[PDB]
């Protein structure tokens, strides 16, 4: 102490060789340095709650690595043992008991509005992700990926592909198999538009299968609406064409542009509108609230008049859902893993089973003891497990 709590590098520079020569001297200094590593990172990272707070967190994690790598590679000749200390300390300054969600917010702001500057800044991001312990990053990201892909708000395609290209290297095709499908569609969608334009503006986007986490007709529209099935007559077959009226929009010449209140304006701008809802009246009530919001003179039950007092151009529940939406897949994978492991070995210890399943499924999810406790309930519900009654620690094959 007092030589690692501060540093005059001459002192421990002399110190290292002597303890490397004599046996059993080194281990103490490893933990001694590890203890001092945390102090920075437990400092200057707390008391940080403000606007644009995800940026500051990543703008403070990196400097701890940066300063401490130079010393362990200069004063003391590089040693994998000293590398191990820094890593373990860094694997416990950003995973204590939000930050995994904050990382997605970090990526969201940068891409949304120089390219070399963007690449240089994104280069540092890949370092922090390797220390995070990831399901939220795998699922939560596609949600604002979709909002950037559609409704405009799409950046240089090069940056979008570069993010994927860099992230794919770290975890291979398995982690990010899906998202390669989304970006390919938009290039195909533009090409798909070109061919069917000749069958005659109405522009149309297609969406691949149901892998995307994305989820009365106007009387003037049917002529083009049912003409789209001629595209099936051309090159598609058996696919259920899905006019998803909820999320879509469109710039139309009413004589805003989201189909909820365009569906309202289909009778407004032109009881009868209540029949035209083709849906529950609560959703239409939401759409009339949209009118009541700003600058729209209803006679109001649904009695409506006009306003002569006329831009020229027309949520915690999300993460509340995402908290358990991933968890369901966690329970399913826990059941799977339980079946495979106790049916394979058949003679293993059940606490050793807990450890083995922890080792096998560590990459898939962070293990939790209670979920493992509740595994046997459904298996014994059907008596699927041939639960070894002589010793629950030992197993017998289910058949």
Minimum distance, C-beta of residue 136 to other proteins, in the bound complex (Å)? 22
Phi, psi (deg, nearest 5) at residue 295: 75, 5
**According to CB under 8 A, which one of 65, 343, 349, 387 is a site residue for other proteins?**
343
| Interaction residues for other proteins, span 280-299 (CB under 8 A) | none
172 binds other proteins (CB under 8 A): no
Q: Is 208 in the site for other proteins (CB under 8 A)?
A: yes
User: Looking at 1, 113, 235, 240, which residue binds other proteins (CB under 8 A)?
Assistant: 240
Note whether 370 binds other proteins by CB under 8 A.
no
C-alpha distance from residue 370 to each of 212, 310, 376, 398 (Å)? 32, 60, 11, 23
* CA-based torsion, 339, 341, 346, 349: positive or negative: negative
Site for other proteins in 144-163 (CB under 8 A): 150
The reply on whether position 339 binds other proteins by CB under 8 A is yes
List Cβ neighbours of 298 (8 Å cut-off, separation of 6 or more).
288, 291, 292, 304, 305
Closer residue to other proteins, CB minimum distance, 98 or 239? 239
205 binds other proteins (CB under 8 A): yes
Work out whether 199 is an interface residue with other proteins (CB under 8 A): no
What DSSP assignment string belongs to 25-77?
-HHHHHHHHHHHHHHTTSSSSSS--STTHHHHHHHHHHHHHHHHHHHHHHTS-
C-alpha–C-alpha distance, residues 20 and 38, integer Å: 25
Q: Is 247 in the site for other proteins (CB under 8 A)?
A: yes
Distance CA 216, CA 278 (A): 6
Which residues lie below 8 Å from residue 296, measured CB to CB, with a gap of 6+?
A: 307
Total residues at interface with other proteins (CB under 8 A): 43
**Which of residues 218 and 367 has its CB atom nearest to other proteins in the complex?**
218
How many Cβ atoms from other residues are within 10 Å of residue 167's Cβ?
A: 19
One residue of 57, 106, 140, 212 binding other proteins per CB under 8 A: 212
Closer residue to other proteins (CB): 69 or 244: 244
Taking phi over 0 as left and psi of -120 to 50 as alpha, with beta for the rest, 172 belongs to left
Q: Is 209 in the site for other proteins (CB under 8 A)?
A: yes
Indicate the SS3 state at residue 372. helix
The reply on whether position 236 binds other proteins by CB under 8 A is yes
- 127 near other proteins, judged by CB under 8 A: no
Residue 119 pairs with which residues in a beta bridge?
A: none
Rounded to the nearest whole angstrom, what is the least distance from the CB of residue 228 to other proteins in the complex? 8
Binding other proteins by CB under 8 A: which of 233, 250, 314, 319?
250
Which one-letter DSSP state was computed for residue 22?
A: S
Residue 73 contacts other proteins per CB under 8 A? no
**Nearest distance from residue 299's CB to other proteins, in Å?**
30
Q: Does 9 bind other proteins (CB under 8 A)?
A: no
The residues of the shown chain that bind other proteins, judged by CB under 8 A, are: 150, 173, 177, 201-210, 212, 221, 228, 236-244, 247-253, 257, 332, 335-336, 339-340, 343, 382, 384, 398-399
């Amino acid at each position: 102490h007092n030589i690692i709590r501060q540093e005059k590098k001459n002192d421990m520079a002399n110190m290292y060789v002597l303890l490397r020569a004599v046996s059993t001297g080194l281990p103490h200094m490893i933990q001694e340095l590890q203890n001092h590593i945390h102090d920075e990172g437990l400092r200057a990272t707390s008391n940080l709650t403000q606007e644009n707070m995800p940026t500051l967190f990543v703008e403070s994690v990196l400097e701890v690595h940066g300063k401490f790598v130079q010393l362990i590679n200069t004063v003391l000749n590089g040693d994998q043992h000293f590398m191990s200390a820094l890593d373990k300390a860094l694997t416990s300054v950003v995973n204590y008991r939000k930050a995994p969600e904050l990382l997605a917010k970090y990526c969201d702001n940068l891409l949304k509005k120089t390219e070399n500057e963007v690449e240089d800044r994104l280069t540092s991001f890949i370092t922090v992700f390797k220390y995070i312990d990831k399901d939220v990053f795998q699922k939560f990201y596609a949600r604002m990926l979709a909002k950037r892909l559609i409704h405009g708000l799409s950046m240089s395609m090069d940056s979008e592909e570069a993010m994927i290209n860099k992230l794919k290297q770290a975890c291979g095709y398995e982690f990010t198999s899906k998202l390669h499908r989304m970006y390919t569609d938009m290039s195909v969608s533009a090409d798909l538009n070109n061919k069917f334009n000749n069958f005659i503006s109405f522009q149309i986007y297609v969406l691949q299968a149901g892998a995307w986490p994305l989820t009365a007709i106007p009387q003037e529209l049917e002529k083009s609406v049912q003409m789209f099935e001629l595209f099936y007559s051309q090159h598609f077959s058996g696919r259920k064409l899905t006019w998803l009226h909820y999320l879509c929009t469109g710039e139309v010449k009413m004589n805003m542009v989201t189909t909820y209140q365009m569906a309202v304006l289909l009778a407004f701008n032109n009881k009868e509108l209540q029949d035209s809802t083709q849906m529950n009246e609560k959703e239409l009530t939401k759409t009339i609230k949209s009118l009541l919001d700003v600058k729209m003179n209803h006679d109001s039950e649904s009695s409506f008049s006009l306003n002569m007092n006329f831009r020229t151009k027309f949520t915690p529940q999300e993460m509340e859902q995402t908290r358990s939406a991933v968890d369901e897949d966690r329970k399913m994978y826990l059941q799977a893993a339980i079946v495979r492991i106790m049916k394979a070995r058949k003679v293993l210890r059940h606490n050793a089973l807990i450890q083995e399943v922890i080792s096998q499924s560590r990459a898939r999810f962070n293990p939790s003891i209670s979920m493992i406790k509740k595994c046997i309930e459904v298996l014994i519900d059907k008596q699927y497990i041939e639960r070894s009654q002589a010793s629950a620690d030992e197993y017998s094959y289910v058949a």
